[PDB]
Write a protein that binds this DNA or RNA. Structure first.
Ligand SMILES: [Mg+2]
Length: 580
DNA sequence: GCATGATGC
DNA sequence: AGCATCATGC
């Protein structure tokens, strides 16, 4: 039974009501400078479909879009906000975003269209987007009659679903999470994405040029040491050369064949000169394919800017993800790749890159939630926690902890945050399970509060059905009751880790909101460019650096008050690389 | 389409 | 070993 609506040829006052479900359709997955395919409005006066050329050309409609007192309910308002920024139009008054509401209620649903969100509440009078647009080569906007009905049905679903979603969020104590954290953050992310990050493409091409020389040399060498040529990127090919031709030990059997994972090659290095070369070629190869070629593919030719899209409704812990390009996984560990960062520069003359990062926020969050006296005292003294953990588990004074002891204690700290298991630690440290179990037992002896939290959080997940973070984000863990040990253990690890990684996500998100408000009050020209889990990257006039040095760390450190202090380090320079 | 293996925090 | 995205091979 088709849905009734007015396919309007011009905007009417009836369509500019104080509250409405609004759909501003952008079908292209990447909405940056993308077309707005159609518009639907549903309010007390009825259901309307508007052609974009006509609506966005109408001063009253545009004014209505920008009037913050006219409330709109939408699904993925950030997509609309950004598509509109590229057209010079401001969207204001979004009081409810169904995508974010669905995500908070249950991140696992994987809700990515109005249909999926509506199904959560047994509402199925709307089609999935893929059903009407198709996928890939078949993706396409349908003719007006079909397009118009789909947008109206989506707007109708949003109009109908807003109350039940808000009611459940309030029952979950997530009402403020949506209205005071995620929705305001959505606007900040739209600004970041729209601003983009300037790329020195010439520097990138230079690098790409040199990289190509090195790759050839390492490749030729590999063929030499191999006795002949083969596809170094072909797993099969590599495995035959390594384990058959060269007779290297197979101390890790892949499904049916051999493993050439990094740690395995790392273990075989001692046996043959070719292994070191293979790992280096993989290193350089990743730089070339993803951080040079792949990057250059998404840089805008006119402005030389890259505009990522932060997916705010994807991760199971509350973190953001970044795509096209992923600006959250730019190399930094190895110097060769870290240089890629020299290509990320300020967007204006005489501006600089400013980077601020939390120091051990996960462990500090753990100290707070576990209320472990020893861990809390360590952060109160601002000690190096890895040296401190080594001192405690290996029972030695600071003077006697060796580099090897610190390295292993650090690995224990990682395991504790990830959700500890003797096998996971054994694998990471390349030791036996019993030895790893011993390290863990000694850890819990020194940090009994943490031990109690890990036991308690697992029982709680079992009792309630989910775990939560500081700001009430939640994650259901059905598998925690599974009778399969491996399946149950993965859930137990999630129970242990989620509240830590998730609360750290909550904190930095609130810091971003607090920071922008401070930035605005001060009328500073500085603005956010990126967020990479526990760090914020901005660019600003060189004349604002001194102010930023005091402002950013303070806002980040004060975003939330924990039982231990929060500490933020910062650096700035002429490129992202120099912001160290 | 999925596995493998790289990158980040 | 927790959470992610991208390029490649088959
Ligand atoms: Mg850090």
């Amino acid at each position: 039974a088709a849905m009734a609506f007015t396919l309007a040829d011009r905007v009417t006052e009836e369509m500019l009501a104080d509250k409405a479900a609004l759909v501003v359709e952008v079908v292209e997955e990447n909405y940056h400078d993308a077309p707005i395919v159609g518009i639907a409005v549903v309010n007390e006066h009825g259901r309307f479909f508007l052609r974009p050329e006509t609506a966005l050309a109408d001063p009253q409609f545009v004014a209505w879009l920008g009037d913050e007192t006219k409330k709109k309910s939408m699904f993925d308002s950030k997509r609309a906000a950004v598509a509109l920024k590229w057209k010079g139009i401001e969207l204001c008054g979004v009081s409810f975003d169904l995508l974010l509401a669905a995500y908070l209620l249950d991140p696992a649903q994987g809700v990515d269209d109005v249909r999926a969100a509506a199904k959560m509440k047994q509402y199925e009078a709307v089609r999935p987007d893929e059903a009407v647009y198709g996928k890939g080569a078949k993706r396409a906007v349908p003719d007006e009659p079909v397009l118009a009905e789909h947008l109206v049905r989506k707007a109708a679903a949003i109009w109908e679903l807003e109350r039940p979603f808000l009611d459940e969020l309030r029952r979950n104590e997530q009402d403020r999470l949506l209205v005071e954290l995620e929705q305001p953050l959505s606007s900040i992310l739209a600004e970041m994405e729209f601003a983009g990050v300037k790329v020195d493409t010439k520097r990138l091409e230079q690098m790409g040029k040199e990289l190509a020389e090195q790759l050839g040399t390492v490749e030729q060498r590999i063929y030499e040491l191999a006795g002949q040529e083969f596809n170094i990127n072909s797993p099969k090919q590599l495995g035959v050369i390594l384990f058959e031709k060269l007779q290297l030990p197979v101390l890790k059997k892949t499904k049916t064949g051999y493993s050439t994972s990094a740690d395995v090659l790392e273990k075989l290095a001692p046996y043959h000169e070719i292994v070191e070369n293979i790992l280096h070629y993989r290193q350089l190869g990743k730089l070339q394919s993803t951080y040079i070629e792949g990057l250059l593919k998404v840089v805008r030719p006119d402005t030389k800017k890259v505009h990522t899209i932060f997916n705010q409704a994807l991760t199971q812990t509350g973190r953001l993800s970044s795509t096209e390009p992923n600006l959250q996984n730019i190399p930094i560990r190895l110097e060769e790749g870290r240089k890629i960062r020299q290509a990320f520069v300020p967007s204006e003359s005489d501006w600089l890159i400013f980077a601020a990062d939390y120091s051990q926020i996960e462990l500090r969050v753990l100290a707070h939630i576990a209320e472990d006296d020893n861990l809390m005292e360590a952060f109160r003294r601002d000690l190096d926690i890895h040296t401190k953990t080594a001192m405690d588990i290996f029972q030695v004074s600071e003077d006697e902890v060796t580099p090897n002891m610190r390295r292993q204690a650090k690995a224990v700290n990682f395991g504790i945050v990830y959700g500890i298991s003797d096998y996971g630690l054994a694998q990471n440290l390349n030791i036996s399970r019993k030895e790893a179990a011993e390290f863990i037992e000694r850890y819990f002896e020194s940090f009994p509060g943490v031990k109690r939290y890990m036991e308690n959080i697992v029982q709680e997940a079992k009792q309630k059905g989910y775990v939560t973070t500081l700001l009430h984000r939640r994650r259901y863990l059905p598998d925690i009751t599974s009778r399969n040990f491996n399946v149950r253990s993965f859930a137990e690890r999630m129970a242990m880790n989620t509240p830590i990684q998730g609360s750290a996500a909550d904190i930095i998100k609130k810091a971003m909101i607090d920071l922008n408000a401070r930035l605005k009050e001060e009328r500073l020209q500085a603005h956010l460019l990126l967020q990479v889990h526990d760090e914020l990257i901005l660019e600003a006039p060189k004349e604002e650096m001194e102010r930023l040095c005091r402002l950013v760390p303070e806002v980040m450190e004060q975003a939330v008050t924990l039982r231990v202090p929060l500490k933020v380090d910062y650096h700035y320079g002429s490129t992202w690389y120099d912001a160290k």
